[PDB]
Amino acid sequence: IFLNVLEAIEPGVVCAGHDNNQPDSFAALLSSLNELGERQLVHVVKWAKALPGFRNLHVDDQMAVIQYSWMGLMVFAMGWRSFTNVNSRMLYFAPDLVFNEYRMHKSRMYSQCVRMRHLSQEFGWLQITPQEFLCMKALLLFSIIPVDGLKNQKFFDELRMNYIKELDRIIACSRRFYQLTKLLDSVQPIARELHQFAFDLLIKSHMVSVDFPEMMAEIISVQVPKILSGKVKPIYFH
Numbered sequence: 001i002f003l004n005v006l007e008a009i010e011p012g013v014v015c016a017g018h019d020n021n022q023p024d025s026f027a028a029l030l031s032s033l034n035e036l037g038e039r040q041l042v043h044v045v046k047w048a049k050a051l052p053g054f055r056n057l058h059v060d061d062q063m064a065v066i067q068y069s070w071m072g073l074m075v076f077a078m079g080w081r082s083f084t085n086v087n088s089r090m091l092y093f094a095p096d097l098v099f100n101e102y103r104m105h106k107s108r109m110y111s112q113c114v115r116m117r118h119l120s121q122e123f124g125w126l127q128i129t130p131q132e133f134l135c136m137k138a139l140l141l142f143s144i145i146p147v148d149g150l151k152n153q154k155f156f157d158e159l160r161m162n163y164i165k166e167l168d169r170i171i172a173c174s175r176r177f178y179q180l181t182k183l184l185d186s187v188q189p190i191a192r193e194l195h196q197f198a199f200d201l202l203i204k205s206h207m208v209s210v211d212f213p214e215m216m217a218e219i220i221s222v223q224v225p226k227i228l229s230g231k232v233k234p235i236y237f238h
């Protein structure tokens, strides 16, 4: 039942709307990454609200958790698409926004891109199944919380525990759980580097001609700083 639901709510293809006929430029690539990010957020919200037991969380906790986990969720899914679509040869942000090394360099997000390409290769090396991927991705939504706690922290803890139990079931084992939890942990440092990048970019956006969609701008200025300042932290296994 659980996996049937995860498979059923998994978002479909999301395009960036990027102009690939134009020579690559920092401003164009980033404006497309921003637009893509916003488009995916719409789906992340619909996805999360359709997850088993998610509605139990306090209305305000639902939105906060989605906004904090947003980057990580996207990173993990992008790595999987890269692995399945182009065998980690490039980064498949979207069908119309594929990054080769040249674009990784031009986007000024080279370090982060290479870490995501490594994550992408990990799916193959570890032979991650589509079902382990789906459960791990859902678990990611419940892997970052405020030090001051949520409105209903207990309901959150219960939900996170249940998702971990589902992973146990999909695995059924010790070595596998170690492998998967280590892989999940690896997502956080990457999301952090991207968060820092997005923050610095927003602060100087008017100087580099980069366009930031409304929702993203608000989230980068209100939520992301809470993560960068340590008020909101990821939950690591290790």
Ligand SMILES: C[C@](O)(COc1ccc(F)cc1)C(=O)Nc1ccc([N+](=O)[O-])c(C(F)(F)F)c1
Pocket (backbone or CB within 6 Å): 030, 033, 034, 035, 036, 037, 040, 067, 070, 071, 073, 074, 075, 076, 077, 078, 079, 093, 094, 116, 194, 195, 198, 216, 219, 220, 224
């Ligand atoms: C530069 C930026 O547009 C920033 O987007 C943000 C996304 C979330 C957030 F909290 C702050 C910024 C970005 O990283 N976009 C982006 C778009 C799509 C994907 N993707 O589909 O996986 C990613 C990725 F997760 F890879 F890094 C990143």
